[PDB]
Amino acid sequence: RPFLCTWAGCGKRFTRSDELQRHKRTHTGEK
């Protein structure tokens, strides 16, 4: 099961779900 960020024009892939969620936090603005 590969993880892919299906955000508006992103398409960045991860092998870890925690990586994907962590990454997603940059879109939502959790910094």
Q: Which residues contact Zn ion (rule: CB under 5 A)?
A: 5, 7, 10, 12
- Going by the DSSP 8-state scheme, the letter that residue 1 receives in this structure is -
Of the two residues 10 and 16, which places its CB atom closer to Zn ion in the complex? 10
For 5, phi then psi, to 5°, come to -80, 105
Shortest distance, position 13 Cβ to Zn ion, whole Å: 10
Shortest distance, position 27 Cβ to Zn ion, whole Å: 5
Of the two residues 1 and 26, which places its CB atom closer to Zn ion in the complex? 26
Element spanning 3, H or E: strand 3-4
